[PDB]
């Protein structure tokens, strides 16, 4: 016997990995006992521990199953070099088109090297639907149970059972882990998945195993994406191996018909353009029609208008992402005869339905885009990118013959970018800060991103999560924190700036207006102006205009869009909206909005006010918003002093370009000949000092004593960004600032005045 330390560190080499550093800090320290034997005392316990975490390991390898590849993968055949690759790299990048095996097979090969035994195998997907359906397939084929080897983990902490080897999550979950796992001790290889989409969640995984790996010489890290752009994830992790597969797919015939303008109506046009769609498919065979579609309203439109055609056998079936246990596994059952599944852009991430013969690409989606002409984080409804266009074509490339309409020219298509801007290059700086505090991924500018965002926009994101009181401003030891309001902004779907006012809402019970308006500024203006029609959609538009703030204005639209609704069929509305000039794409994502919005703000317990609120209950929340979008006007020019001395000009389409008052806050400022100020609604500067107390600077003059006082009187200037919001009040100086009243007397420099 006569165990040493030498010895029984060598031992922890058979040991789970979460154990190893638990046992080492333990050995690192039998130093300090004194007497000899006393040590040896300490070692014979600790190696009974050790052996009962040896043999732990040894129960969990006599419990792995025998594994074993399905054959007509096309993965299978490159198993080869996958195999070893991992075996003798740390980082793999393994690129394959849809339908190769890739997914399902690669954790089996890890496993099938000796891992997911002293570590967990995590395997990441970007949705929860996905991360459940892949565990459930792999299990299948490896012909275990749930409860199994096979895992998953969503819904943040209800952990997998000891059994698991392969723990499959979402990405989300993966970075929530971080906080308390900060080395990612709990696991022994890393799958991160779909990694071509290129989200904040997925560049965030990105870098932060970059940061890991000098730590951790015992991880494996595998990236698993769509041949779009591999070398982008090999140049990461210093020029890591690829390996591409190939897919099976069945060769897709791709049929272009562009919109024609024929209804006078946008939205009409679109839906016969659904139609005939349909109509041109059922021609060829019954298959099953996939149909993209923009957003979630538009879904329930359309599959009202094609309920109510009661095309022969065919069962119009929408998705949303309300769908619950017993509404996700309808779409991977068996049916008797066609079905129509239209489904928003979720079918190119998660979504995999089986059984799809044709697709309807009307080729637009809804992208988080940050503008750079004015600054909030939009969501327009875009032309979608070749890389795109492709995977949606590629969602029928099963079937004998799979067909893919195209509701645009080929001349379209191929003037597209070919792939789409990754999520950090669209996104408010502000946004990213404020999710990497969170995490505790550092500083933005010290992390290692796969494509890093412009350095110059950084302090610009600093200000404004100062503006808004979102981050510390506090000296740590040198480092960024959230407040808890900054905590509540990240979990809100819409711009920093406007979530800042949904949460002053609550103070206000102004949150039904304030959903309104910030869900209104989010997207692209719904109200049209034809430039044949000019004169025509400004009548229309001028039913909601008000005398103060064309913020309201949205409100009143809001108001009328909703008791509108409420009278007039699918049909009719959609005609409204043609009557009215308003996009009634852009009305429908607006109503998206103000649901998505509307379901945070109540899992964040802040009650919704059913009675109007007035004009300053509400301006006083959008004005915490908006502190350096306010105005003060010129004596006798029209035009408007800034936050950082800057001067703007009222934009003329508003409603106080009329008759400008002397305080005014504006949603956005843009330069096209002028400093130019877009919505804007007159303000009280007595609201601006309450809601600035971070930002206001209070400077004093004509300090002097008043016998009537009997202390020092001074004059006090209070300005926000520089404007004066106070220009000058008397106060009792002598307290605030006794020393200076001090120094004052004695100079002979007191003598009273007023």
Avoid at 201 to 207: A, H, V
Avoid at 304 to 325: C, F, G, M, Q, V
Avoid at 569 to 593: G, H, K, M, P
Avoid at 702 to 728: D, F, N, S
Wanted: proline residues 5%; glycine residues 6%; contains cysteine.
């Amino acid at each position: 016997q006569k165990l040493t330390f030498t010895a029984l560190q060598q031992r922890l080499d058979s040991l789970m990995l979460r154990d190893r550093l638990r046992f080492s800090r333990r050995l690192h320290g039998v130093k300090k006992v004194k007497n000899p034997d006393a040590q040896q005392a300490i070692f014979q316990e600790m190696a009974k521990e050790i052996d009962q975490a040896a043999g732990k390991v040894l129960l969990r390898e006599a419990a792995r199953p025998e594994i074993t590849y399905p054959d007509n993968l096309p993965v299978s055949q490159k198993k080869q070099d996958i195999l070893e690759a991992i075996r003798d790299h740390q980082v793999v990048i393994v690129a394959g088109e849809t339908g190769s095996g890739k997914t399902t097979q690669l954790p089996k090969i890890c496993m099938e090297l000796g891992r997911g035994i002293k570590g967990l195998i995590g395997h990441t997907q970007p949705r929860r639907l996905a991360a459940r359906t892949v565990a459930n397939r792999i299990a299948e084929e490896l012909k275990t149970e749930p409860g199994g080897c096979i895992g998953y983990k969503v819904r943040f902490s209800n952990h997998v059972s000891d059994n698991t080897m392969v723990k499959l999550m979402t990405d989300g979950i993966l970075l929530a882990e971080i906080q308390q796992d900060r080395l990612l001790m709990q696991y022994d290889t890393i799958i991160i998945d779909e990694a071509h989409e290129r989200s904040l969640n997925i560049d965030f995984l990105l870098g932060y195993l970059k940061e890991l790996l000098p730590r951790r010489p015992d991880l494996k890290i595998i990236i698993t994406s769509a041949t779009i752009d591999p070398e982008r994830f090999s140049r990461h992790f210093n020029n890591a191996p690829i390996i591409e597969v190939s897919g099976r797919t069945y060769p897709v015939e791709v049929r272009y018909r562009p919109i024609v303008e024929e209804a006078d109506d946008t939205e009409r046009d679109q839906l016969q353009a659904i139609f005939d769609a349909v109509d041109e498919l059922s021609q060829e065979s019954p298959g099953d029609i996939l149909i993209f579609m923009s957003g979630e309203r538009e879904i329930r439109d359309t599959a009202d208008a094609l309920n109510k055609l009661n095309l022969r056998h065919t069962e119009i079936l929408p998705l949303y992402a309300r769908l619950s246990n017993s509404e996700q596994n309808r779409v991977f059952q068996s049916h008797s005869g066609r079905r129509i599944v239209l489904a928003t852009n979720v079918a190119e991430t998660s979504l995999t339905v089986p059984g799809i013969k044709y697709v309807i690409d009307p080729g637009t989606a809804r992208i988080s885009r940050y503008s750079y002409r004015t600054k909030v984080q939009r969501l327009p409804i875009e032309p979608i990118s070749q890389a795109s266009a492709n995977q949606r074509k590629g969602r029928c490339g099963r079937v004998s013959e799979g067909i893919c309409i195209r509701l645009y020219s080929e001349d379209d298509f191929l003037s597209r970018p070919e792939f789409t801007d990754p999520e950090i290059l669209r996104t408010n700086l502000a946004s990213v800060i404020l999710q990497m505090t969170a995490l505790g991924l550092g500083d933005i500018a010290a992390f290692p991103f796969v494509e890093a965002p412009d350095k110059r926009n950084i302090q610009d994101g600093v200000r404004l999560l100062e503006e808004l009181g979102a981050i510390t401003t506090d000296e740590q030891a040198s480092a960024y924190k959230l407040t808890p309001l900054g905590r509540q902004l990240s979990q809100l779907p819409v711009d920093p700036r406007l979530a800042r006012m949904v949460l002053e809402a609550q103070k206000h019970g102004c949150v039904r207006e304030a959903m309104i308006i910030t869900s209104a500024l989010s997207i692209q203006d719904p109200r049209e102006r034809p430039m044949d029609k000019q004169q025509a959609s400004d009548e229309k538009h001028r039913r909601f205009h008000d005398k103060e703030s064309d913020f309201l204005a949205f409100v009143n639209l809001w108001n009328y869009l909703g008791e509108q609704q409420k009278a007039l069929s699918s049909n009719a509305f959609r005609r409204l909206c043609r009557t009215d000039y308003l996009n009634y794409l852009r009305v429908r994502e607006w109503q998206d909005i103000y649901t998505q919005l509307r379901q945070v703000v109540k899992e964040l317990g802040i009650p919704v006010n059913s009675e109007p609120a007035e004009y300053r209950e509400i301006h006083i929340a959008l004005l915490t918003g908006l502190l350096s979008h306010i105005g003060m006007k010129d004596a006798d020019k029209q035009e408007y002093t800034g936050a950082r001395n800057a001067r703007f000009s009222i934009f003329p389409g508003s409603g106080l370009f009329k008759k400008p008052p002397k305080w005014v806050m504006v949603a956005e400022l843009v330069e096209t000949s002028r400093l130019w100020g877009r919505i804007a609604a007159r303000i009280d500067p007595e609201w601006v000092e309450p809601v600035a107390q971070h930002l206001i600077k209070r400077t004093y003059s004509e300090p002097h004593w008043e016998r009537a006082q009997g202390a020092v009187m001074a004059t006090e200037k209070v300005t926000v960004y520089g404007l004066p919001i106070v220009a000058a009040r008397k106060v009792n100086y002598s307290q605030i600032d006794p020393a200076l009243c001090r120094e004052l007397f004695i100079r002979h420099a007191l003598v009273e005045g007023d």
